Structures are given as structure tokens and as C-alpha cells.
Amino acid sequence: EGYLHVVGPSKVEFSDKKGDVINNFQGTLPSVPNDWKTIRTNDFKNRKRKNEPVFCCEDDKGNYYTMAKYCETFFF
């Protein structure tokens, strides 16, 4: 039994340079959701081994958003 430490989705990297993990995609990446408790994961950084998931994104401009951190913490 214990408390849940939930801080939200962070560890985000945003740019316009079209980095390596935003390019290796399956096309038509979605736009930015308006609230949390809704942002789910989209792709994997490693594809042969099911390692760390990511979330590639976009907006009305050419800003590319990638995000790690698929977990929260819990102290008991």
C-alpha cells in the first residue's frame, strides 16, 4: 500500500531539424492533443527489441515533438 507520484508527461524534445527518430516513422503523424491523461505512445525507438516507446507529434507550424517517459512512480 502506498502513494502514487504522478507528475505528467515530460522529457520532451521539440525542434524543426527533422531528427532521426521523427523521420523513421510510418507517415501522417498526428497533431497535439489538448489535455493529458490522453497522450498515449505512438512508436518505438528500438524496433527489433521492444524497448523505450516514444510519441511523435506535430502542430500547425513545423515543430516536431518527441517524448519518452511512459511511466510514473509509486512509493509504498
Partner RNA sequence: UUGAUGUCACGGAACAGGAACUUGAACAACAUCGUUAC
Nearest alpha carbon to residue 30 among 38, 42, 19: 42
C-beta closer to RNA: residue 59 or 72: 72
If one asks whether residue 7 binds RNA (CB under 7 A), the answer comes out as yes
Residue from the set 26, 71, 75, 76 that interacts with RNA by CB under 7 A: 71
Smallest distance from the beta carbon of 41 to RNA, in angstroms? 10
Q: Where are the beta strands (DSSP E) in the chain?
A: 3-5, 12-15, 43-44, 53-54, 64-67, 73-75
The residues, ordered by sequence, that sit 6+ positions from 15 with a Cβ below 8 Å of its Cβ are 63, 64
**Binding track, positions 28-67, relative to RNA; x by CB under 7 A:** -----------------------xx---------------
